[PDB]
Write a protein that binds this ligand. Sequence first.
Ligand SMILES: CCC1=C(C)/C(=C/C2=NC(=C\c3[nH]c(/C=C4\NC(=O)[C@H](C)[C@H]4CC)c(C)c3CCC(=O)O)/C(CCC(=O)O)=C2C)NC1=O
Ligand SMILES: CCC1=C(C)/C(=C/C2=NC(=C\c3[nH]c(/C=C4\NC(=O)[C@H](C)[C@H]4CC)c(C)c3CCC(=O)O)/C(CCC(=O)O)=C2C)NC1=O
Ligand SMILES: CCC1=C(C)/C(=C/C2=NC(=C\c3[nH]c(/C=C4\NC(=O)[C@H](C)[C@H]4CC)c(C)c3CCC(=O)O)/C(CCC(=O)O)=C2C)NC1=O
Ligand SMILES: CCC1=C(C)/C(=C/C2=NC(=C\c3[nH]c(/C=C4\NC(=O)[C@H](C)[C@H]4CC)c(C)c3CCC(=O)O)/C(CCC(=O)O)=C2C)NC1=O
Ligand SMILES: CCC1=C(C)/C(=C/C2=NC(=C\c3[nH]c(/C=C4\NC(=O)[C@H](C)[C@H]4CC)c(C)c3CCC(=O)O)/C(CCC(=O)O)=C2C)NC1=O
Ligand SMILES: CCC1=C(C)/C(=C/C2=NC(=C\c3[nH]c(/C=C4\NC(=O)[C@H](C)[C@H]4CC)c(C)c3CCC(=O)O)/C(CCC(=O)O)=C2C)NC1=O
Ligand SMILES: CCC1=C(C)/C(=C/C2=NC(=C\c3[nH]c(/C=C4\NC(=O)[C@H](C)[C@H]4CC)c(C)c3CCC(=O)O)/C(CCC(=O)O)=C2C)NC1=O
Ligand SMILES: CCC1=C(C)/C(=C/C2=NC(=C\c3[nH]c(/C=C4\NC(=O)[C@H](C)[C@H]4CC)c(C)c3CCC(=O)O)/C(CCC(=O)O)=C2C)NC1=O
Ligand SMILES: CCC1=C(C)/C(=C/C2=NC(=C\c3[nH]c(/C=C4\NC(=O)[C@H](C)[C@H]4CC)c(C)c3CCC(=O)O)/C(CCC(=O)O)=C2C)NC1=O
Ligand SMILES: CCC1=C(C)/C(=C/C2=NC(=C\c3[nH]c(/C=C4\NC(=O)[C@H](C)[C@H]4CC)c(C)c3CCC(=O)O)/C(CCC(=O)O)=C2C)NC1=O
Lengths: 161, 57, 49, 160, 160, 49, 162, 162, 162, 162, 162, 162
Amino acid sequence: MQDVIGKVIAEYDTKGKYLDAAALDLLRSYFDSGDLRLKAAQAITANAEVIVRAASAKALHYTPVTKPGGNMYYARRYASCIRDLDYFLRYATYAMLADNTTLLDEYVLKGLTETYRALGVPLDISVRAINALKEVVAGQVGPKAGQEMAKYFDHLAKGLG
Amino acid sequence: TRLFKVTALIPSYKKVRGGRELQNTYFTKLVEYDRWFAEQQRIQKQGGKILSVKMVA
Amino acid sequence: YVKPLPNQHPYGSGNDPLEIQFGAIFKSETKAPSARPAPIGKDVQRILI
Amino acid sequence: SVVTKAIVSADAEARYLSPGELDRIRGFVSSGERRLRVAQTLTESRERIIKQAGDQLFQKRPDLVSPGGNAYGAERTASCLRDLDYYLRLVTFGIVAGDVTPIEEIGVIGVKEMYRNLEVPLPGMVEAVKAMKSVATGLLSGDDSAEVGYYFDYLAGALA
Amino acid sequence: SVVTKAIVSADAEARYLSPGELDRIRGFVSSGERRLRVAQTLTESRERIIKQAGDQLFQKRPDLVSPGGNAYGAERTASCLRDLDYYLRLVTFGIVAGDVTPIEEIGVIGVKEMYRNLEVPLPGMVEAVKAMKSVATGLLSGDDSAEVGYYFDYLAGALA
Amino acid sequence: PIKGTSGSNIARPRFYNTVMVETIEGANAEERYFNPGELSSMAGFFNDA
Amino acid sequence: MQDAITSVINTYDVQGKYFDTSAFDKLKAYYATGELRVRAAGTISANAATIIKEASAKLFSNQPDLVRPGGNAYTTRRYAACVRDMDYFLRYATYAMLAGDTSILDERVLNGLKETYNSLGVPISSTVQGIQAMKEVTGSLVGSGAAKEMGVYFDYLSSGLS
Amino acid sequence: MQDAITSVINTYDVQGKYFDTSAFDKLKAYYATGELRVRAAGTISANAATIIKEASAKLFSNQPDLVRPGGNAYTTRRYAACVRDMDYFLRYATYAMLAGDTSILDERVLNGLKETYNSLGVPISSTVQGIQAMKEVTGSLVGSGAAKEMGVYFDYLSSGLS
Amino acid sequence: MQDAITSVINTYDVQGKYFDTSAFDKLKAYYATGELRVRAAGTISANAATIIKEASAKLFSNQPDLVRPGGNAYTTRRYAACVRDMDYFLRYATYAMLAGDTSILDERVLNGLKETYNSLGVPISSTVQGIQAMKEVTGSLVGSGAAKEMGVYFDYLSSGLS
Amino acid sequence: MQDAITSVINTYDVQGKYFDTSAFDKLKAYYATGELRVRAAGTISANAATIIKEASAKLFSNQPDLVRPGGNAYTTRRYAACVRDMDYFLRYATYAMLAGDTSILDERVLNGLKETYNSLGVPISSTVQGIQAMKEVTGSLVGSGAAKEMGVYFDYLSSGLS
Amino acid sequence: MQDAITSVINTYDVQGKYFDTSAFDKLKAYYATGELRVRAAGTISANAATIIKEASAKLFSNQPDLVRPGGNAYTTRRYAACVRDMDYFLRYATYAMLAGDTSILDERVLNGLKETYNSLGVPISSTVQGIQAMKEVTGSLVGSGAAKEMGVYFDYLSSGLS
Amino acid sequence: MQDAITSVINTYDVQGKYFDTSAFDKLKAYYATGELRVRAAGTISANAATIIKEASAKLFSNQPDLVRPGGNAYTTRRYAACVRDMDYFLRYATYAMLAGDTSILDERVLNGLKETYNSLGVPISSTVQGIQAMKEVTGSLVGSGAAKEMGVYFDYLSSGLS
Ligand SMILES: CCC1=C(C)/C(=C/C2=NC(=C\c3[nH]c(/C=C4\NC(=O)[C@H](C)[C@H]4CC)c(C)c3CCC(=O)O)/C(CCC(=O)O)=C2C)NC1=O
Ligand SMILES: CCC1=C(C)/C(=C/C2=NC(=C\c3[nH]c(/C=C4\NC(=O)[C@H](C)[C@H]4CC)c(C)c3CCC(=O)O)/C(CCC(=O)O)=C2C)NC1=O
Ligand SMILES: CCC1=C(C)/C(=C/C2=NC(=C\c3[nH]c(/C=C4\NC(=O)[C@H](C)[C@H]4CC)c(C)c3CCC(=O)O)/C(CCC(=O)O)=C2C)NC1=O
Ligand SMILES: CCC1=C(C)/C(=C/C2=NC(=C\c3[nH]c(/C=C4\NC(=O)[C@H](C)[C@H]4CC)c(C)c3CCC(=O)O)/C(CCC(=O)O)=C2C)NC1=O
Ligand SMILES: CCC1=C(C)/C(=C/C2=NC(=C\c3[nH]c(/C=C4\NC(=O)[C@H](C)[C@H]4CC)c(C)c3CCC(=O)O)/C(CCC(=O)O)=C2C)NC1=O
Ligand SMILES: CCC1=C(C)/C(=C/C2=NC(=C\c3[nH]c(/C=C4\NC(=O)[C@H](C)[C@H]4CC)c(C)c3CCC(=O)O)/C(CCC(=O)O)=C2C)NC1=O
Ligand SMILES: CCC1=C(C)/C(=C/C2=NC(=C\c3[nH]c(/C=C4\NC(=O)[C@H](C)[C@H]4CC)c(C)c3CCC(=O)O)/C(CCC(=O)O)=C2C)NC1=O
Ligand SMILES: CCC1=C(C)/C(=C/C2=NC(=C\c3[nH]c(/C=C4\NC(=O)[C@H](C)[C@H]4CC)c(C)c3CCC(=O)O)/C(CCC(=O)O)=C2C)NC1=O
Ligand SMILES: CCC1=C(C)/C(=C/C2=NC(=C\c3[nH]c(/C=C4\NC(=O)[C@H](C)[C@H]4CC)c(C)c3CCC(=O)O)/C(CCC(=O)O)=C2C)NC1=O
Ligand SMILES: CCC1=C(C)/C(=C/C2=NC(=C\c3[nH]c(/C=C4\NC(=O)[C@H](C)[C@H]4CC)c(C)c3CCC(=O)O)/C(CCC(=O)O)=C2C)NC1=O
């Protein structure tokens, strides 16, 4: 996993040249948006359980998935679903602070898909829950930060799908 | 009959874990021959499913 | 835990001198810990040969 | 980068970033303009800094250019210039990144065996990096020279 | 069940069933008929048990169906009674199995953090299951009542 | 009564975590000195103090 | 790893329904067979050493080439491995007979065993023949009523390996 | 025992050398500090019973469990034993301070005290608290310069118990 | 750990003796009280939270200094640790009562408890008071004979800490 | 050394509480059994020599190798020390019975006894057999109730040694 | 561990009162030195290897016998262990300086240091001299203002050993 | 872990035959060659560092792209892996040479090596060129008699890579 700074340093080391005006401008773009990302990080950190709870309520509670025969039908399976939503929210926050999607692939998407096959987890309901979590996060953090969160959330959705 | 390449997924039934535990549940590992009987027994008693095993050497 | 008190000085096994002709040789708590404390009460009477 | 370390440490304990780590990233992003300005300043000084570091190293360690030294010879100077250039580039990468991980990964992890392969003395490395630090801090402002000093002394200490 | 736990325990030591384990399984299979009687009686009168279980739960804790409560609303109260139905069914499953491992595997492991996501008060759950225990033990004879109430007390302790 | 003793140390439970305590134990856990990020964070903490 | 009781519990829990009269009858059947199951398991635990003795002897009698050099069991190591395989198979068959369900065979016996033998090259035919040798003998010791019960589990192991 | 002057003498004896400039510098340092050491020693000797009184009162106020029933200091016998231990600690800390070396603390006090307390059941934490109480009580009496000198020996006793 | 049966078995095993009439008398006496013990254990399992809550209320009412600043119950964290220790004591008293022997109380609870509490700073006397509060609460809920039996083990815990 | 009365006094002192009904009940129970204890103690005191003679005879008859050459009881001095030890065990069991507590056995008898015998080379199992020999000999003289009472202390000595 | 802030907070929390004038004075004093101490910590962190080099050079020049045969530092392994111990002392002194408290030194260095150095045979006086040498080198490197702050904790370590 | 002497034993085991004259002849050939085999091993282990030195120098002279950025060897870590791969090739070639069999190359080196280099972006051709440049220096140093046997292992490494 790497940040924007890590990515640009890797690129310019592969090229073998110092950081030019373009790289410095991208670094300034990353640092200027730093305060916004940190504020959204405050918001997600403080209200993470509220966000996950709202996402579960809007996406999962009264669908047949929580009914017997559904994948969420157990105290253990429901708790595991909420735990997965906690994973997605926390690692989306990590990706936002990093301003990169590599940590999502390495930490969250590494072996998750076929693991969901084996456990019997439905992909589409998971993507729906991720989308609902994205809506809740955007609502809590405002449009500017929600736009950034949307990239990481639909990255997770595409990785699942 | 030296090494086994084992891809296995061990779920969790006793509780829910807050840490990552994704590589701990699904993983591929190289296991020696003298150890593979015990390792297979441990995986089967944990409730995990052995997805595949192959001969490397 | 599962046995009676040892034959030991009330203030620890490191408080027992070596019974030799002369010298006053005691165990040290720092050179090698080798320390066993025991709940020897105030009235316990030691068994002496 | 500082953010990378913070995210790794946050994952290590399996929770969101602490207020201390969040304030660390606050101070890191708030100081971005100054750090980029310092790194840009290190760039315009290319041949100047490289040569004062080089000849200061030659004065400090005459054995390197003396007969029997590993750097003895005119052809060795061409490698000297680009090696000092590589280390300067790594220093700038660390300056912008805020941590020495680019330096550690690109030029420190495995440098010991690398210079053992070339039969290069590590004391030559520490003296060269000290010359670079002297020149760079002399060129840079005291407040910024203090921040670059950590990177240069880390380079020296890691090279030996 | 008793057989499953005995088999698991024997398999842990890679041995056969002990004379004590064979004896415990023998005692389980000997009294299975009475467990079937208890489970049938509980199942036949499920709707009553649920209805007045909700009755004492809501009269003992009016705040739950008071405004601002977790159970306010026809849908939310219906989900309340459906949760009670789930737990009564789990208790009957445990009666049949001879132990509480169905309750563990279905409705106990992770119940706290699930009802945390649901805002559901656990004291309310305890009161509801205690009302269920009182009613169910009331319908059954004392010899039955003791073992039937042990499962309900187990569930109450799990929720508490 | 107890037949044996293991001794009593001086226990040091953690009541809460301070920024300085968190940074220093982060450095000590990896058994290292301080990186520029932690140094800047401690400077900022002493500024905001 | 589920017995008949847990099997009906799961098949009724997945649909969300309470027990029916048919479920109670199916429970009654297992509760009735429990005593003979326990007696058979006790006799098997008693004689497990003897059934291993005779099973190894008969397997290495009908097929000579295994013990002889170049055989699938030609080593003290491979001999011990084969007899240990018989021991584990028989213990797990006894477990399944007590539980009354074949899930334990899937979840602790057939879980990764088939492709393990495929990679190792273990002959499936010889293993299956060993299983018949084991069950045809164990049926005599456990009695016909328990013999027919052990038969389904031994045949399930054979079909899984086959 | 051993003090600072005897420490220099002993190291130069083991090395078999006459005194060098470093040895004379160490001796001059001790001679410089000696007058302050004597003043502090006289002060503590004057106020020994007082210092013990306030230190014990402070410890038993911070940890009232000790003196109350069920506490290690709850009896006339056990309370007197606690006060006696505190008097020993103060006297030997004064000896170490006046000597300029902590060897007397190692031999006479610290070599055996942990095991004694662990066998007796004395709380070592509370005893370290009592030593710290004596330290902060005696610091105000001896004066800041002498307080700095006495603090190292009280810290030595506290670290030896811990 | 050991129960009454295992205690009799050990006391006849060290002597190399078969069970005599007195041993069978003791075993019969233990078997007589088994149903009472199971009933009391089930009741206490049903009411453990109530007992811990009301006993903690009684203790903190009679010992107000514990929850005030400087007391060893003064925070939510420290209070929660206290009530968890209370749950420990009730659970192990129930275990010992069901076993019929105090071996588990000495082995898993009492051994090393005073040293642990001395290290932590926990007041042992207040812990004993909490245990006596447990006894007072539990007697009423369990009835006369079960109260005598369970009070034996609460007294054993109190005397072990005292 | 504490008897039942002293044990109650201590359990009430450590709590700091005054005596209440339960303490009076315990002391009344001890006062009730005191007459039995005194009669048994007097009987054992009057017949101590006979008990030792009978028990030593029984032990050396069951284990004749002890008093034959090469046995630990082979010399006049070692035989005297053996019967002296039996006198210790009898006398201290009488003390413990009269006090009603086994504290004197952990307190004056069994502390370091295993190490002492192991250093001397004294057989432990044979000494336990001799303690039993004294138990059966003493029970007949003291009657059924006093034998039931003294048996706990003799078994205490046996278990502590074993 | 603790720091200055945690110590102040606990001091005023155990009493139950808000920060008084002395509390604010201590906090102001701690915060005032914060930037100087951070600058010193950064200088030491970047330059630990140098400080170890000149400090060890000074120590081994003052006491050559350490690095000659028969000296505790005569081996490549024991020389490396010596300089590693010097690095521990430097790093923990830096930690303590930043914390403003000596709690980390008691918890993580002095606890077990005397036992280690007495078991290994390491000379404690020579270790004190090495710590002093690191004191002069660090003071020369980080400036006098930070030199005093770091020398406080170096003196704490030195008095902890001796 | 395959060896020519061990290979003969394995073959006679799997075919179940005794020693034959051909086996003795090949064992004699192996033992006769063994002395020069050890001499070659010692000469290489003497100069393995130097052999790597010139092998890497020739590789980076002939293909210089690898050193500057955009080459797979442009990093201190990647340079380390580059020289470490050559060291591994030389060392395992020597191990095969002492072993007299190439099976160790297949077991521990070649299997998965193509996939690993192609996945990691490692150039196969430059690795083979380095193996050749190390072949030439090893063969020049050892001498033609040793070089004939030593070069075969290098050819087989290259062929597996190619
Ligand atoms: C940090 C990266 C990471 C991820 C992404 C992750 C997902 C994950 N979820 C799991 C279980 C689960 N996950 C779910 C949730 C799914 N089923 C519901 O219907 C939803 C549609 C959906 C979630 C939105 C459920 C129900 C289980 C229980 C599976 C079972 O017991 O059969 C497991 C198996 C291990 C365990 O049970 O503890 C993993 C590895 N774990 C990780 O370490
Ligand atoms: C009768 C049985 C018995 C013996 C033998 C015995 C030996 C003994 N020798 C001692 C001192 C000593 N013993 C020696 C002699 C040794 N060091 C030299 O290098 C020689 C190689 C070697 C003698 C050949 C020395 C030098 C000391 C002084 C060490 C010291 O006291 O610190 C001491 C310390 C107490 C004292 O000095 O009074 C004892 C106990 N103790 C006994 O109860
Ligand atoms: C970005 C990370 C990186 C570094 C740092 C790096 C250094 C490096 N320097 C090399 C050669 C060398 N470099 C030097 C120069 C040094 N040796 C002497 O002792 C002097 C003290 C000192 C000059 C200040 C020398 C003497 C050689 C061997 C021959 C030559 O000059 O090229 C080589 C071998 C290949 C080549 O000739 O280019 C490497 C890989 N490569 C990297 O990918
Ligand atoms: C068999 C294992 C199992 C259980 C136990 C379970 C409980 C459960 N109850 C739910 C809703 C609910 N359950 C309750 C009932 C509670 N709140 C009231 O205050 C009472 C104290 C208490 C009942 C006595 C309520 C009020 C809701 C509505 C909450 C919501 O919709 O957000 C939900 C949300 C999904 C849905 O309603 O379909 C679950 C998962 N699910 C399971 O798979
Ligand atoms: C508890 C369920 C279970 C079992 C029993 C099991 C058996 C098993 N047998 C093995 C090898 C073996 N297995 C056998 C037995 C076979 N060869 C012939 O004798 C027969 C046709 C046949 C007997 C059924 C032999 C001889 C070996 C060693 C030979 C070899 O190295 O290939 C191995 C490889 C690892 C090792 O032996 O340590 C396993 C895991 N695995 C499991 O998960
Ligand atoms: C169970 C046996 C036992 C006893 C008796 C005992 C005595 C005792 N008396 C104390 C103080 C005291 N005792 C007294 C009593 C005095 N006031 C007048 O002068 C009278 C002459 C005299 C009483 C008639 C006073 C006034 C104090 C307070 C002294 C102070 O606060 O400094 C304290 C200290 C209480 C604390 O630190 O919290 C104890 C422990 N301790 C024990 O474990
Ligand atoms: C700052 C962190 C912190 C707080 C505040 C805290 C409060 C606290 N209050 C308590 C008692 C109590 N607290 C209250 C009520 C008060 N509680 C307040 O939140 C209300 C403003 C107010 C009533 C409206 C009452 C009535 C009690 C008595 C015991 C009981 O409630 O059962 C207790 C249990 C200990 C005892 O019985 O004395 C705690 C732990 N603990 C902490 O670690
Ligand atoms: C038995 C294991 C062992 C070894 C090997 C050892 C070596 C050793 N060499 C030292 C100094 C030295 N060693 C050398 C040798 C170097 N000069 C050139 O550069 C060469 C590359 C190289 C020799 C071929 C020199 C010049 C010094 C003096 C440097 C100084 O003043 O610190 C020192 C410092 C103390 C002293 O001078 O006595 C040690 C401890 N010590 C040990 O306990
Ligand atoms: C942070 C807490 C901590 C401390 C303090 C610590 C000290 C320490 N030093 C050790 C060894 C050592 N330490 C020294 C120290 C030197 N000897 C010279 O005479 C000098 C006087 C002196 C330093 C200036 C030496 C020589 C050894 C090797 C001893 C041996 O292996 O026999 C060891 C034994 C383990 C090992 O060899 O690596 C420890 C534990 N370790 C810790 O984790
Ligand atoms: C058991 C015996 C063994 C073999 C055979 C082996 C080959 C091998 N080389 C590797 C990486 C590597 N190998 C090389 C060397 C190649 N690239 C250079 O440009 C040259 C053309 C050429 C060497 C002459 C390099 C540069 C890497 C690093 C690739 C990376 O960054 O991941 C790796 C992956 C480990 C890593 O990336 O750090 C293996 C397994 N390793 C072994 O342990």
